[PDB]
Amino acid sequence: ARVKRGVVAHRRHKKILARAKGYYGARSRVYRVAFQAVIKAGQYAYRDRRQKKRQFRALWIARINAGARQNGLSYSRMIDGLKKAQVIIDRRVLADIAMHDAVAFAALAEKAKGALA
Amino acid sequence: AKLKTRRGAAKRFKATANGFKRKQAFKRHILTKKSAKRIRQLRGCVMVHVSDVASVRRMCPYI
Amino acid sequence: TLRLNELAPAEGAKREHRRLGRGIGSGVGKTGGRGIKGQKSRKSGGVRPGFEGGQTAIYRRLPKFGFTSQIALKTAEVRLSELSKVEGDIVSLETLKAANVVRRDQIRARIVLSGEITRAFTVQGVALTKGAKAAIEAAGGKVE
Amino acid sequence: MNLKTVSGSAVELSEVAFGREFNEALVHQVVTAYLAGGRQGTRAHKSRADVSGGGKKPFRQKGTGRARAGSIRSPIWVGGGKTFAARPQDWSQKVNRKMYRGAMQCILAELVRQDRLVLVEEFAVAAPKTKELLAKLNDLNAARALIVTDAVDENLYLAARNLPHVDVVDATAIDPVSLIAFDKVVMSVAAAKKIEVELG
RNA sequence: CUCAGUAGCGGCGAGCGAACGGGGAUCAGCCCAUUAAGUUAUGUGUGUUUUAGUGGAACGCUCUGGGAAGUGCGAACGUAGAGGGUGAUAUUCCCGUACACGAAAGGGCACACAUAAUGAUGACGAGUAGGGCGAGGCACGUGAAACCUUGUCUGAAUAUGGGGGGACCAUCCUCCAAGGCUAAAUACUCCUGACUGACCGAUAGUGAACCAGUACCGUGAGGGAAAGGCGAAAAGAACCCCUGUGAGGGGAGUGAAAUAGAUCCUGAAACCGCAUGCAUACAAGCAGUGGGAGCACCUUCGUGGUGUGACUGCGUACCUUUUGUAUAAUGGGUCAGCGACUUAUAUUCAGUAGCGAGGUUAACCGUAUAGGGGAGCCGUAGAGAAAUCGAGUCUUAAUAGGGCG
RNA sequence: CCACAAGUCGAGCAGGUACGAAAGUAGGUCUUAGUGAUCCGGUGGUUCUGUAUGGAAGGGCCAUCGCUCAACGGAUAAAAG
């Protein structure tokens, strides 16, 4: 029972090369180079699925800081005031309101500052 | 082919009901200086230690 | 049922054999379970049985003892319960050999008390232990 | 056991030969053993010693820049020997006598249970003509069949030789694979009695 | 085939390794000078086989199609439904197959007869048996070393005799050396015929599917390749045009198909062009990844699809070997194909199946995976170096004690 | 105590004994170093074995002897640059 390797080997190499579409030079043409490039891409994606949450939280905090300083507070004081006033709205929604509706953010700042007083 | 016994080991070990028995060393010569207690306590057969049983089994497959 | 494509072995009767050196996922890839370097990782790598690295071996630092008897190789031992295989009621060396409880090259036999018998036997020219003789007589037999 | 022939008469068959409970694992082992025993096992390959040439070292050990080589017939090189060259093999297995008999009894009991066995008082043909046997089987509703007879008549043999899916055998020549392969088994009463004496 | 990896041999190391007995295959004895069985040639007569060959059954419509053996419907032969071919897949189209028949001539084997030869220079075994010295063979390495062969030196008795039974002696048992012949069971395949394969399918299988032991290499012995495929049928492209009366092409024509057009089935990857869309000439690094504007085409008009990725956070390949490698430590120019835990026997453990105080046959016979074959092996009892005893036994003066059970 | 092979302490029971009136003490010396496995052979005993049988030779068991094998768990009987 002699077994030839061609069809299965060709299919495997072709699947790797298909996942390597768009890369520069030999990384999309040569199997040895393309195979290393796909594994490293997978590792990078795994790590960046964790990095993404940190980056977006930092962005929300920056936009909230800008809104609070326009309304006369700092980010830390505004967060403290809201926590003392029992408001449980999160930073993503607070940043959305800060960017798109200034009057509602001013009302939230008034609530926080009243709680601080 | 067939497994072959190590005849040197076959001349040294014999099988009991649950193990192997052996003779004791240091009783061949230089006996005057040895005390009577050693002379009479090194006489007779003892059992093969559990650490050497496996090797004895590999060396003597049919006993 | 009962077709050549509807028959299977009992569960647990067959296993796949171990194939070394076929990739990371298999768990026995690369070195194939042999470890890293040394004599045992080479082809035909084991040392001779009884070799202990150079110190005097267990079977050579101990003394030899005894001698081998030749009549013991032709003496035969028979359990009492084995007497039931004998056809007839005469127990002798020839009838034991015919019943195949004794090898054809044994010159004498001994009967020991190991089991039980119910029939009455007559024993001729076969040695008996005290317990075996008591059992044979208690079951109704006799000797010569 | 009491079983009727095709024409309504009664026959008495032993429970041991025709009523034993089915053991699929045992039957599978025996059938696989028979199929393995059918193999021929004739083949060979040439190792690095058997291949022509290759006695001399191709080039010196050091200084050339090549990977070191000892022969042009190494199993790494194209055209070299096979690493593990095969030899003719024997594929037969040992089957215990009692295991074979028990498997045969189980197979016959299952055939009786599934009604693929037909008992016939007498089975004979008058001339070695295929059409006569075909008509007899067609009226018996046994178009595809193994016919087990006590003693094989020449006319029966010659009539059956050319029929597809029809075979004829003696009572002492039945085998576990052929008992299963065919759709129905037509058995004479004398053959059943002899098989009973043989205990399956 | 067992006995048995037993008894033994062995720097008593590594290792080497019987016999007796039992079960099978095949079976057979005959002679030493008037000379046997047998064998080989020659010739004759019977039987068998072989080297060419002859006959050999039975299918039509309909659909798809370049082509029917394929679809649907309904028939026939079968002692023939093995195989091969035919424009795709045929028991009834062809060659054949089951079966029946056949030899001027020639050869092989077997049996009987006849004529030679040979067995057969040999008539009961003397430089022989035995011994001293040195070696060889026996499972047996000088060992307590019997037995066999002999290079050298010697040397009997001769049936009231002689050889052997593992140093040697006695007794018992057994055999008759120093003269011969003899089939079968056993070993093998350069060859010839038939058949078969859970053997290969052109980097495989022979080195060799092809004008291969060739080309080529070497003074020589010797070493030793690569290279299969148009189409069913050449129907292998008349004639016209560009060009050098070239190569190569464009029409026309053949074909089911010419991107089947001659190194011609299919035609993958590395590698090299042309066309379209987007990005790119103020910006520093394993080239991606998470975000993300704009543009182009498509569109079920979007919280859609496809291509591109300005700007931005993070981010020093893979394998091996190492305490530890981005390491300036090893290996890889790339692609495609090939390339490494096997097979036989023995043994131990774990699963699983049968039988169960029992289980199981080996060689072998066998119209042969069946059925026979019980020799043998494992289990059922230990203690002791052993003789011996035996649910006990060894040690000892001991029934005490203790060790193995 | 200890990988193994080895090593160390030991009350008490039986027999024979010495010294004490006796209860008793004694299985070497205050203790911890003064040492060498297996193989091969020698010597004294022995109710074991004894290749047809009776013996014997040889072997076994008990006691004991031969190594500066000191590279001291000791690759050979036998070895420098």
Please tell me which of the candidates C4, C8, C9 has its beta carbon nearest to residue D180: C4
- For residue C76, the cross-strand partners are C109
Tokens of A72: 């006369």
Residue C115: give the domain boundaries. Answer: 71-143
The pair of three-digit structure tokens given for residue A39, joined into one six-digit string:
């594994």
Distance, CA of A70 to CA of D68 (rounded, Å): 78
CB D163, CB D195: distance < 8 Å: no
| Separation between Cα atoms, residue D181 and residue D175, nearest integer Å | 10
Q: What are phi and psi of C61, to 5 degrees?
A: -95, 5
For the sheet with B45-47, list strands across it.
B14-15, B20-23, B45-47
**Number of structural domains found in chain A:** 1
CB D124 within 8 A of CB C15: no
Q: Does C8 touch chain D (CB under 8 A)?
A: yes
Cβ of C67 under 8 Å from any chain B Cβ? no
**Residue among D31, D192, D188 nearest D108 (CA):** D192
Q: What sign for the dihedral angle of Cα D171, D174, D180, D182? A: negative
Contact C110, C126 (CB under 8 A): yes
A70: which 2 tokens?
């326009």
In angstroms, the CA B29 to CA A72 distance is: 107
Strand ranges, E, within A1-117? none
Positions on chain F within 7 A of a protein C-beta: 3-8, 10, 27-28, 35-41, 49-51, 59-66, 73-74
Domain that holds residue A93: 1-117
First to last CA, chain A: 87
Q: Is D2 exposed, middle or buried (0-12, 13-18, 19+ CB in 10 A)?
A: exposed
Say how far apart CA D89 and CA D127 lie, in whole Å.
Answer: 45
Strand F close to B8 by CB, under 7 A:
no
CATH number reported for the structural domain that contains residue C118 in this entry: 3.100.10.10
| Cβ partners under 8 Å of residue D47, min gap 6 | D81, D82, D83, D84, D85
> B25-58 burial by CB neighbour count: b if 16+ within 10 A, else e?
eeeeeeeeeeeeeeeeeeeeeeebeeeeeebbee
Amino acid at D16: V
DSSP of C28-63: S-TTTTS-SSSSTTSTT-PPPTT--SSSPPTTTSS-
∠ CA D147-D151-D156, nearest 5°, is 55
On whether the CB atoms of residues D135 and D171 are closer than 8 A, the answer is: no
Give me C27's structure tokens: 């768990």
| Total domains in the fold of chain B | 1
- How many Å from the N-terminal Cα to the C-terminal Cα in chain C? 64
User: What type of residue sits at position D45?
Assistant: H
Q: How far apart are alpha carbons D192 and D2 in whole angstroms?
A: 13
Residue D76's identity, in one-letter code, is I
Segments forming the whole domain that contains residue B24? 1-63
| Contact assessment for residue A57 and residue A65, using Cβ atoms and an 8 Å cutoff | no
* DSSP H or E run through D186: strand D184-188
Residue D189 corresponds to which tokens in the numbers above? Answer: 């009463």
* Residues of chain B by 3-state class (helix, strand, coil), percent to 5: 30, 15, 55
Whole-angstrom Cα distance, residue C74 to residue C69? 10
- C3/D28 Cβ within 8 A: no
Cβ contact C67 with chain F strand, < 7 A:
yes
- Residues whose CB is less than 8 angstroms from the CB of residue D95 and which lie 6 or more positions away in sequence, other chains included: D29, D30, D33
| The two structure tokens encoding residue D130 | 């295929």
Instruction: Give break positions in chain A: residue before each, C–N beyond 2.5 Å.
Output: none
- Listing DSSP states for A33-60 in one string gives HHHHHHHHHHHHHHHHHHHHHHHHHHHH
Pairing of strands B20-23, B45-47: antiparallel
Alpha carbons C66 and A72: distance in angstroms, whole number:
108
Give the sign of the dihedral formed by CA A95, CA A101, CA A106, CA A108. negative
Query: Is D114 in the C-facing interface, judged by CB distances under 8 Å?
Result: yes
Q: At what angle do helices A6-19 and A31-70 cross, to 10 degrees?
A: 30
Closest-CA distance of chain D to residue C13, Å: 9
Residues B4, B9, B15: CA angle, nearest 5 degrees:
95
* Cβ-based contacts of C62 with chain B (< 8 Å): 12, 22-23, 25
C-beta separation of D39 from D151 below 8 A: no
What is the number of other CB atoms lying within 10 angstroms of the CB of residue D40?
8
